[PDB]
Amino acid sequence: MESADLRALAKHLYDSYIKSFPLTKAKARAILTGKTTDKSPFVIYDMNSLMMGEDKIEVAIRIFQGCQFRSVEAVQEITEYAKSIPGFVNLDLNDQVTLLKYGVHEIIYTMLASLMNKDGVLISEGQGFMTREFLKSLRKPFGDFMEPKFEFAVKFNALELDDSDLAIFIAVIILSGDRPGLLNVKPIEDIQDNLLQALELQLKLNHPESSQLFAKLLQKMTDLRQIVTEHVQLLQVIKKTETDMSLHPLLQEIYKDL
């Protein structure tokens, strides 16, 4: 509630976020813009360059399986970040699981934007860069499955948030009291109110020329709710066709109840 206490919370969440996530937005921006000789990624834009890149760093399943592996690693990183949110580990254990169950996808998408520009996405911890054209041009259902992630990222990235903002935003998402099945909504909201207070002040101080960025950033939490919906309705269709494909037990369990 007091200003020094809110800045204190912001520093705690940023320092923790740096510790939980291996590749920040600031390092990703440095790789994506370039002018550097040491951080230059190998670019995959077609089938042949994908074969060479595996020596350096079916095709559509192999790329899909690559996304699965990272999303599982991301859920692990998000779970570790979540534990550091003051108050989270003190909630009813069922609500802990329930907040994570519905929060990871909205967060995975948000942080996936940090790795993208309009032309592609960083992979292999930034050693690689796979183009948007190549992904969107994958066959049958997989092409249309990759592109909405880019469509979201382009719009989210125009807000020009940095990592210090995202650490607080990611926390507000996790601590949503409107998830289905929560047992005690009140203590989750009390945490979110503080986190929101912390976000508002962080955004006011860090982005003082950006009018009403707080309101605009909460409205992006709208776009995320719908985009996760589309994602799970498209993934369900894809498993019905690709009898081979299987999902990591961690992702499996999140999607069992959607």
Ligand X SMILES: CNC(=O)c1cccc(COc2cc(C(=O)O)ccc2-c2nn(C(=O)c3c(Cl)cccc3C(F)(F)F)c3ccc(Cl)cc23)c1
The residue ranges that bind a second copy (CB under 8 A) are 178, 192-193, 196-197, 200, 211-212, 214-215, 218-219, 221-223, 225-226, 229
CB of 92 to ligand X, least distance (A): 25
How many CB atoms sit inside 10 A of residue 214's CB? 17
State yes or no: residue 194 binds ligand X (CB under 6 A): no
Neighbours of 241 (CB within 10 A): 10
254 binds, options a second copy, ligand X, none, Cβ within 5 to 8 A by partner type: none
Asked whether position 166 contacts ligand X by CB under 6 A, the answer is: no
Nearest position to ligand X, beta carbon: 66
Separation between Cα atoms, residue 36 and residue 57, nearest integer Å: 18
Which CB, 92 or 230, lies closer to ligand X? 230
Ligand-binding site membership of 150 (annotated): no
Which candidate, 97, 40, 101, places its Cα nearest to that of 256?
Answer: 101
91 lies in the site for ligand X, by CB under 6 A: no
Contacted by 109, from a second copy, ligand X, none: CB < 5 to 8 Å by type: ligand X
* Other C-beta atoms lying within 10 Å of the C-beta of residue 120: 22
Do the bridges between strand 116-117 and strand 128-131 make them parallel or antiparallel, or are there none, so unpaired?
A: unpaired
Annotated ligand binding at 114? The verdict is no
Annotated binding-site residue? 71:
yes
The binder of ligand X chosen from 18, 60, 61, 74 (CB under 6 A): 74
Q: Does 173 bind ligand X (CB under 6 A)?
A: no
Residue 18 engages ligand X in binding (rule: CB under 6 A):
no
Check if the beta carbon of residue 133 is closer than 8 Å to that of residue 63: no
Q: Which of a second copy, ligand X, none interacts with 218 (beta carbon under 5 to 8 A by kind)?
A: a second copy
**Phi, psi of 158, deg, nearest 5:** -60, -20
Q: How far apart are CA 37 and CA 24, in angstroms?
A: 19
Q: Which residues contact 229 (CB under 8 A, 6 or more apart)?
A: none
| 78 contacts ligand X (rule: CB under 6 A) | no
Residue 39: burial class (beta carbons within 10 Å; 0-12, 13-18, 19+)? middle
Window 48 to 67, contacts with ligand X (CB under 6 A): 62-63, 66-67
Residue 94 C-beta: closest distance to ligand X, Å: 22
N- to C-terminal Cα separation, the chain: 35
Choose among 240, 218, 168: nearest CA to 198. 168
Question: Which residues define the annotated binding site for rosiglitazone?
Answer: 68-71, 105, 231, 255
> Which residues contact ligand X (rule: CB under 6 A)?
62-63, 66-68, 70-71, 74, 105, 108-109, 111-112, 115, 121, 123, 130, 135, 146, 149, 235, 251
Question: Which residues define the annotated binding site?
Answer: 68-71, 105, 231, 255
